[PDB]
Structure 1
């Protein structure tokens, strides 16, 4: 029904004077542990504001994961700039497989029986945009009157 998680936090770089700026950036995720996921980035002064702008973005989007035999319905490509992500299905009764930062997204989608490669930037705020380009590139047929599978 509902799963929530925190992935990353980083202070804004800017030397503004003299001193540095007090703006922070945050990345959070939402899902159901059954087949759905949503994500949010946010920017504000200090972490207790930046994390809430991120949560309020993550609580405004939801995408379905195409599943078969409890794993991905097919291998899929998803790209955003330097994050050139490929996601592929794994074997029965498996979960490691998943580790690193990809575990934090698969933990809210519910499916650790999924293997990924980034082929470039693993930068958390940018790789999260490439994985959802892959979830928009997931096939759900809508073809079974002519083509095989399911």
Structure 2
């Protein structure tokens, strides 16, 4: 069965005549627990309905990840604007690790063995775009058997 996870929710406000009005902006992930993951971002009134508004996109967006023996076949970068993340594989044991936005993406795909670092902006709404750019940058999962010799 599929799994849903929150990363963060933040208050967002507009100043008006006689006071102030506010909404929430939420960031979520959806994954299969075996190697497929997607993310949602959205803004609405009340936390649970801002989470529901972010899930509108997470019910469409997905990347399938290339894996070799339960972990990464190579180290890789992920890029979006000022977010410049790096990923590298770990051995069977400890391996997760990483900040609240990067850790959520690794959790919901079962990839609990990657030494993920931000090496740029940690901003949750942009480090997610760089993380999923890195999952799209992954080369095909049997490449060592094709790359041997000539």
Shorter-chain TM band: 0.7 to 0.9
Does the CA contact (< 8 Å) of 1:29 and 1:39 recur in 2?
A: yes
Secondary structure of 1:90's aligned partner:
coil
- 75-84 or 94-103, larger mean C-alpha shift: 94-103
Give me the whole-angstrom Cα distance separating, in 2, the residues matched to 1:26 and 1:101. Answer: 12
* Offset of residue 4 of structure 1: 1.1
The structure in which a higher percent of residues are helix is 2
Give me the whole-angstrom Cα distance separating, in 2, the residues matched to 1:70 and 1:145. Answer: 17
Give me the whole-angstrom Cα distance separating, in 2, the residues matched to 1:52 and 1:46. Answer: 10
Give me the whole-angstrom Cα distance separating, in 1, the residues matched to 2:89 and 2:145. Answer: 25
Secondary structure of 2:126's aligned partner:
helix
TM-score, with structure 2 as normaliser: 0.87
Does the CA contact (< 8 Å) of 1:97 and 1:115 recur in 2?
A: yes
* Offset of residue 21 of structure 1: 2.5
Distance 1:17 1:96, change over 3 A: same
Give the corresponding residue for 2:11: 11
Give the corresponding residue for 1:126: 126
Give me the whole-angstrom Cα distance separating, in 2, the residues matched to 1:61 and 1:12. Answer: 24
Distance 1:99 1:11, change over 3 A: closer
Aligned alpha-carbon RMSD (Å): 2.6
Give me the whole-angstrom Cα distance separating, in 1, the residues matched to 2:145 and 2:89. Answer: 25
Give me the whole-angstrom Cα distance separating, in 1, the residues matched to 2:110 and 2:91. Answer: 15
Give the corresponding residue for 1:63: 63
Q: Deviations over 1:20-71 (max 9, x none)?
A: 3322100110001111101000111222321111112111111111111211
Instruction: Count the aligned residue pairs.
Output: 150
Does the CA contact (< 8 Å) of 1:27 and 1:51 recur in 2?
A: yes
Distance 1:145 1:115, change over 3 A: closer
Give me the whole-angstrom Cα distance separating, in 2, the residues matched to 1:99 and 1:124. Answer: 9
- 35-44 or 73-82, larger mean C-alpha shift: 73-82
Structure 1: runs of 5+ lacking an equivalent = none
Give the corresponding residue for 1:103: 103
Secondary structure of 1:79's aligned partner:
strand
Structure 2: runs of 5+ lacking an equivalent = none
Give the corresponding residue for 1:76: 76
